[PDB]
Amino acid sequence: XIMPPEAEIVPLPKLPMGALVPTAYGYIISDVPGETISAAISVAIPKDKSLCGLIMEYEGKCSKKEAEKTVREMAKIGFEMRGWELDRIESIAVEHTVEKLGCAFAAAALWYK
Amino acid sequence: XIMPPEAEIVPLPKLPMGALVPTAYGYIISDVPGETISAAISVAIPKDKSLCGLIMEYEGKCSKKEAEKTVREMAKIGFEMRGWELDRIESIAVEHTVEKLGCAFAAAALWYK
Amino acid sequence: XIMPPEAEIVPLPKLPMGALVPTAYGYIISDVPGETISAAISVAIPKDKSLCGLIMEYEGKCSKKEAEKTVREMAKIGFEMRGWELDRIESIAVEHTVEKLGCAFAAAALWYK
Amino acid sequence: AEINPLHAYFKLPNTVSLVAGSSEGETPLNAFDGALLNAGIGNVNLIRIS
Amino acid sequence: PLHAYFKLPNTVSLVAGSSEGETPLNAFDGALLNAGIGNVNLIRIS
Amino acid sequence: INPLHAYFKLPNTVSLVAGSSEGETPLNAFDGALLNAGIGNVNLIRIS
Ligand SMILES: N=C(N)NCCCCN
Ligand SMILES: N=C(N)NCCCCN
Ligand SMILES: N=C(N)NCCCCN
Numbered sequence A, B, C: 001x002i003m004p005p006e007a008e009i010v011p012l013p014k015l016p017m018g019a020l021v022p023t024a025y026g027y028i029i030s031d032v033p034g035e036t037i038s039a040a041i042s043v044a045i046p047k048d049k050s051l052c053g054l055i056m057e058y059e060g061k062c063s064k065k066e067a068e069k070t071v072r073e074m075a076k077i078g079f080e081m082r083g084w085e086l087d088r089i090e091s092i093a094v095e096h097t098v099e100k101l102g103c104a105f106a107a108a109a110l111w112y113k
Numbered sequence D: 001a002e003i004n005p006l007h008a009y010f011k012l013p014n015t016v017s018l019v020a021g022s023s024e025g026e027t028p029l030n031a032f033d034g035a036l037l038n039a040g041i042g043n044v045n046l047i048r049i050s
Numbered sequence E: 001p002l003h004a005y006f007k008l009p010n011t012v013s014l015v016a017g018s019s020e021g022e023t024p025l026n027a028f029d030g031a032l033l034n035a036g037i038g039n040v041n042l043i044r045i046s
Numbered sequence F: 001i002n003p004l005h006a007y008f009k010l011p012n013t014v015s016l017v018a019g020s021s022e023g024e025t026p027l028n029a030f031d032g033a034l035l036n037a038g039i040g041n042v043n044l045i046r047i048s
Helices: A064-082 B064-082 C064-082 D028-039 E024-035 F026-037
Strands: A020-030 A036-046 A054-060 A086-097 A102-111 B020-030 B036-046 B054-060 B086-097 B102-111 C020-030 C036-046 C054-060 C086-097 C102-111 D015-024 D045-048 E011-020 E041-044 F013-022 F043-046
Touching: A020 A036, A020 D045, A020 F026, A036 A064, A036 F013, A054 A064, A054 A102, A054 D028, A064 A086, A064 D028, A086 A102, A086 F013, A102 F026, B020 B036, B020 D028, B036 B064, B036 D015, B054 B064, B054 B102, B054 E024, B064 B086, B064 E024, B086 B102, B086 D015, B102 D028, C020 C036, C020 E024, C020 F043, C036 C064, C036 E011, C054 C064, C054 C102, C054 F026, C064 C086, C064 F026, C086 C102, C086 E011, C102 E024, D015 D028, D045 E041, E011 E024, F013 F026
Parallel strands: A020 A054, A020 F043, A036 A102, B020 B054, B020 D045, B036 B102, C020 C054, C020 E041, C036 C102
Antiparallel strands: A020 A102, A036 A054, A036 A086, A102 F013, B020 B102, B036 B054, B036 B086, B102 D015, C020 C102, C036 C054, C036 C086, C102 E011
């Protein structure tokens, strides 16, 4: 996940090493050569600024495109369940083709201004 | 889990959206139609209030009744392992009959008065 | 995981009951009578004190010696991936021979002096 | 009135509340989200304690 | 201090333990007790 | 009035990051992915 009301999506700040960062994340690890794995993260931002944002994560044996499409829909569904009006959904995804043993990871890190 | 010493069991307070809430929880997700799933939570409270309470969680493919009985016994065992005097055990449970994809969840949320 | 820069490895402090302690840990549970299970933790310390330490955890159906060797190697690898000069690696390990149902656990508890 | 328990390590929680809920969902995470909402704790960040 | 200063953890302590248990969670609780951190709330870091 | 004790209150920013990496072990691959994402040197407290 939940983005606090009035919080802003910002580029990753300069984090102090060792910081205890509240983070929502999705990840997938695979040891199958040639397998494509992906992880994605999304955040549904409400029109009503008094409400909170909903963070969703996804991982799976699929493409970067499919992972992002899926996670965005998951965030939208969360807002549907709440009956909240949508401003926009921001998301990012990553894919990895396993050579020997790989990991795909996506996260939403909560921090301070 | 651990209920801090002198903590009071209270109905869930109004929580600010996005709050970081320390929570002990048990959950189970099933995609098997007609399957009954349950989750339960228990808190063993000590007679000596200077001591902490013990929170136990449980989830499984069983009834709400079985889940609660099991989680209560788990909290009792924890006090027996410590050799502490048990005052009582507060518990809650929930059961869900899966339609297509369902989740049963039980939790002990630690907060402030 | 991550040991903050300037943090010190010290004997477990007196922790208040119920304290929310950030902890990196590895554990394994087995119900196979006679089975040996182990858990281990390692902390790679940097030569450059402006950098952080790396905490690694390992668990498996093996001996204490194998678990500790593996977890120390994992920390070394982490430092190699970062290209940081390694000062030394501190670790701890434990093994348990299951009677009926047992658990082996190893952790690095982060706190405040 | 806000508090980050991970930073204010010196201020321990002094209350505990038991909640429970269930829900169907289009995905495992949406079902989980639904169950939290049903339990009355769907709009907060749960920091799992162990 | 009269004004709480924000800080990251400055101590790290290595502990370990093991234990039998009637259930997985009770065995885990016993292991934490044997390790010396059974009566605190562990916030697992990743 | 400039806010004080801001770090003791609720987080007010969210950043989306992602990365991937190979690794000799699952944990080393995970660590590599975090490093690739830019958050490899901080402690992640998983929120659910
Ligand atoms: N870099 C991290 N925060 N995590 C991955 C490496 C440490 C795993 N205990
Ligand atoms: N409502 C929650 N706190 N969690 C479930 C929804 C968010 C999953 N990242
Ligand atoms: N003693 C602990 N902190 N944990 C072990 C028992 C956990 C039950 N939720």
